[PDB]
Protein backbone atom coordinates (compact mmCIF):
# COMPACT_ATOMS: atom_id res chain seq x y z
CA UNK A 1 0.00 0.00 0.00
CA UNK A 2 1.19 3.51 -0.89
CA UNK A 3 -0.23 7.04 -0.77
CA UNK A 4 -0.71 7.52 -4.53
CA UNK A 5 -4.38 8.42 -5.01
CA UNK A 6 -6.75 8.73 -7.95
CA UNK A 7 -4.73 6.67 -10.44
CA UNK A 8 -6.20 4.46 -13.13
CA UNK A 9 -4.57 1.02 -13.17
CA UNK A 10 -3.30 0.10 -16.64
CA UNK A 11 -1.41 -3.12 -15.84
CA UNK A 12 -0.09 -5.08 -12.88
CA UNK A 13 2.56 -2.40 -12.28
CA UNK A 14 1.68 0.75 -14.30
CA UNK A 15 -0.76 3.43 -13.10
CA UNK A 16 -1.74 6.75 -14.71
CA UNK A 17 -3.34 10.04 -13.66
CA UNK A 18 -4.08 13.45 -15.16
CA UNK A 19 -1.93 15.54 -12.83
CA UNK A 20 0.82 18.13 -12.57
CA UNK A 21 3.89 16.12 -11.55
CA UNK A 22 5.12 19.08 -9.48
CA UNK A 23 1.91 19.14 -7.44
CA UNK A 24 1.83 15.34 -7.22
CA UNK A 25 5.39 15.24 -5.89
CA UNK A 26 4.73 17.99 -3.33
CA UNK A 27 1.69 16.08 -2.03
CA UNK A 28 3.06 12.54 -2.05
CA UNK A 29 6.77 13.18 -1.37
CA UNK A 30 7.64 9.93 -3.17
CA UNK A 31 10.90 8.11 -2.68
CA UNK A 32 11.70 8.77 -6.36
CA UNK A 33 10.45 11.41 -8.78
CA UNK A 34 11.66 11.06 -12.37
CA UNK A 35 12.85 14.13 -14.26
CA UNK A 36 12.67 14.38 -18.06
CA UNK A 37 16.32 15.42 -18.24
CA UNK A 38 18.73 16.22 -21.04
CA UNK A 39 22.37 15.11 -21.11
CA UNK A 40 23.59 18.46 -19.74
CA UNK A 41 21.04 18.52 -16.89
CA UNK A 42 19.98 21.98 -18.10
CA UNK A 43 16.47 22.17 -16.67
CA UNK A 44 15.07 24.93 -18.83
CA UNK A 45 11.56 23.90 -19.78
CA UNK A 46 9.01 21.14 -19.94
CA UNK A 47 8.91 18.85 -16.93
CA UNK A 48 12.51 19.65 -16.02
CA UNK A 49 11.98 23.40 -15.99
CA UNK A 50 8.88 22.96 -13.84
CA UNK A 51 10.53 20.61 -11.33
CA UNK A 52 13.58 22.85 -11.08
CA UNK A 53 11.44 25.98 -10.57
CA UNK A 54 9.63 24.20 -7.73
CA UNK A 55 13.02 23.63 -6.02
CA UNK A 56 13.85 27.36 -6.24
CA UNK A 57 16.73 26.44 -8.65
CA UNK A 58 18.41 24.12 -6.11
CA UNK A 59 18.03 21.24 -8.59
CA UNK A 60 19.97 23.24 -11.20
CA UNK A 61 22.73 24.18 -8.74
CA UNK A 62 23.19 20.54 -7.74
CA UNK A 63 23.05 19.45 -11.38
CA UNK A 64 25.73 21.93 -12.47
CA UNK A 65 28.10 20.50 -9.86
CA UNK A 66 27.26 16.96 -11.03
CA UNK A 67 28.11 17.82 -14.65
CA UNK A 68 31.29 19.68 -13.70
CA UNK A 69 32.49 16.52 -11.94
CA UNK A 70 31.14 13.75 -14.19
CA UNK A 71 30.44 15.22 -17.61
CA UNK A 72 27.22 14.76 -19.56
CA UNK A 73 24.89 11.81 -19.30
CA UNK A 74 24.23 9.47 -22.22
CA UNK A 75 20.97 9.57 -24.13
CA UNK A 76 19.11 6.66 -22.57
CA UNK A 77 21.04 7.07 -19.31
CA UNK A 78 20.28 8.46 -15.87
CA UNK A 79 21.67 9.64 -12.58
CA UNK A 80 20.25 9.79 -9.06
CA UNK A 81 20.39 13.18 -7.35
CA UNK A 82 18.51 14.82 -4.50
CA UNK A 83 14.76 15.19 -4.68
CA UNK A 84 15.01 18.48 -2.75
CA UNK A 85 11.55 19.52 -1.46
CA UNK A 86 9.76 17.24 -3.95
CA UNK A 87 10.92 13.69 -3.17
CA UNK A 88 13.70 11.82 -1.42
CA UNK A 89 15.54 11.32 -4.73
CA UNK A 90 15.24 12.58 -8.27
CA UNK A 91 16.07 10.09 -11.02
CA UNK A 92 17.15 12.25 -13.96
CA UNK A 93 16.45 10.15 -17.07
CA UNK A 94 17.40 11.20 -20.60
CA UNK A 95 14.93 10.04 -23.21
CA UNK A 96 15.74 10.69 -26.86
CA UNK A 97 14.73 14.14 -28.11
CA UNK A 98 13.14 13.76 -31.54
CA UNK A 99 13.63 17.49 -32.13
CA UNK A 100 17.38 16.72 -31.96
CA UNK A 101 17.14 13.71 -34.29
CA UNK A 102 17.91 11.18 -31.56
CA UNK A 103 17.14 7.49 -32.05
CA UNK A 104 13.69 6.63 -30.69
CA UNK A 105 14.94 3.09 -30.03
CA UNK A 106 16.82 4.64 -27.10
CA UNK A 107 13.45 5.17 -25.40
CA UNK A 108 13.46 1.56 -24.18
CA UNK A 109 16.95 2.01 -22.71
CA UNK A 110 15.73 5.16 -20.96
CA UNK A 111 12.80 3.34 -19.35
CA UNK A 112 15.08 0.49 -18.21
CA UNK A 113 16.52 2.92 -15.64
CA UNK A 114 13.17 2.79 -13.82
CA UNK A 115 13.72 -0.89 -12.99
CA UNK A 116 16.41 0.07 -10.47
CA UNK A 117 13.71 1.59 -8.21
CA UNK A 118 10.80 -0.26 -6.64
CA UNK A 119 8.32 2.65 -6.90
CA UNK A 120 8.49 5.87 -8.95
CA UNK A 121 6.44 8.93 -9.83
CA UNK A 122 7.25 9.76 -13.45
CA UNK A 123 6.28 11.59 -16.63
CA UNK A 124 6.09 9.89 -20.00
CA UNK A 125 9.65 9.89 -21.31
CA UNK A 126 10.35 11.73 -24.57
CA UNK A 127 6.83 13.25 -24.57
CA UNK A 128 6.06 16.96 -24.56
CA UNK A 129 8.89 19.11 -25.87
CA UNK A 130 11.03 16.01 -26.51
CA UNK A 131 8.84 15.39 -29.56
CA UNK A 132 7.94 11.70 -29.37
CA UNK A 133 4.45 10.25 -29.67
CA UNK A 134 3.14 9.91 -26.07
CA UNK A 135 1.04 6.88 -27.05
CA UNK A 136 4.26 5.16 -28.13
CA UNK A 137 6.02 6.25 -24.95
CA UNK A 138 3.27 4.70 -22.82
CA UNK A 139 3.54 1.44 -24.79
CA UNK A 140 7.30 1.29 -24.26
CA UNK A 141 6.83 2.08 -20.57
CA UNK A 142 4.35 -0.76 -20.06
CA UNK A 143 6.52 -3.21 -22.02
CA UNK A 144 9.80 -2.22 -20.29
CA UNK A 145 9.19 -1.14 -16.69
CA UNK A 146 8.59 -3.98 -14.25
CA UNK A 147 8.67 -1.93 -11.05
CA UNK A 148 5.70 0.12 -9.83
CA UNK A 149 5.35 3.32 -11.85
CA UNK A 150 2.83 6.12 -11.28
CA UNK A 151 2.60 8.24 -14.43
CA UNK A 152 1.51 11.88 -14.23
CA UNK A 153 0.14 13.35 -17.47
CA UNK A 154 -0.26 17.14 -17.36
CA UNK A 155 -2.59 17.56 -20.34
CA UNK A 156 -6.16 16.37 -19.73
CA UNK A 157 -6.91 15.91 -23.42
CA UNK A 158 -3.76 13.80 -23.80
CA UNK A 159 -4.56 11.78 -20.68
CA UNK A 160 -8.00 10.88 -22.06
CA UNK A 161 -6.47 9.87 -25.40
CA UNK A 162 -3.84 7.69 -23.70
CA UNK A 163 -6.47 5.87 -21.64
CA UNK A 164 -8.98 5.45 -24.46
CA UNK A 165 -6.38 4.10 -26.90
CA UNK A 166 -4.57 1.82 -24.43
CA UNK A 167 -4.40 -1.81 -25.51
N1 LIG B 1 8.12 2.71 -2.01
C1 LIG B 1 7.43 3.93 -1.94
N2 LIG B 1 8.02 5.14 -2.06
N3 LIG B 1 7.19 6.19 -1.97
C2 LIG B 1 5.87 6.01 -1.78
S1 LIG B 1 4.67 7.30 -1.64
C3 LIG B 1 5.01 8.52 -0.27
C4 LIG B 1 4.55 8.01 1.12
N4 LIG B 1 4.97 6.54 1.32
C5 LIG B 1 4.08 5.53 1.22
O1 LIG B 1 2.85 5.59 0.96
O2 LIG B 1 4.73 4.32 1.45
C6 LIG B 1 6.09 4.66 1.70
C7 LIG B 1 7.20 3.86 2.00
C8 LIG B 1 8.45 4.52 2.20
C9 LIG B 1 8.57 5.93 2.12
C10 LIG B 1 7.45 6.71 1.82
C11 LIG B 1 6.22 6.09 1.62
S2 LIG B 1 5.63 4.19 -1.69
Curated annotation (Swiss-Prot):
User: How does this protein sit in the membrane?
Assistant: Multi-pass membrane protein
| Source domain of life | Viruses
**What is the reaction catalyzed?**
Thiol-dependent hydrolysis of ester, thioester, amide, peptide and isopeptide bonds formed by the C-terminal Gly of ubiquitin (a 76-residue protein attached to proteins as an intracellular targeting signal)
Cellular localization per UniProt:
Host endoplasmic reticulum membrane
Activity: how regulated: Inhibited in vitro by GRL-0617.
Q: Cite the Macro domain residue spans from the record.
A: 1-167
Q: Could you tell me what this protein does?
A: Responsible for the cleavages located at the N-terminus of the replicase polyprotein. Participates together with nsp4 in the assembly of virally-induced cytoplasmic double-membrane vesicles necessary for viral replication. Antagonizes innate immune induction of type I interferon by blocking the phosphorylation, dimerization and subsequent nuclear translocation of host IRF3. Also prevents host NF-kappa-B signaling. In addition, PL-PRO possesses a deubiquitinating/deISGylating activity and processes both 'Lys-48'- and 'Lys-63'-linked polyubiquitin chains from cellular substrates.
Query: What does the subunit comment say?
Result: May form homohexamers. Interacts with N protein.
Q: What is this protein called?
A: Papain-like protease nsp3
Q: State the organism named in the record.
A: Severe acute respiratory syndrome coronavirus 2
Q: What lineage does UniProt assign to this protein's organism?
A: Viruses, Riboviria, Orthornavirae, Pisuviricota, Pisoniviricetes
Residues shown, of full length: 1025 to 1191 of 7096
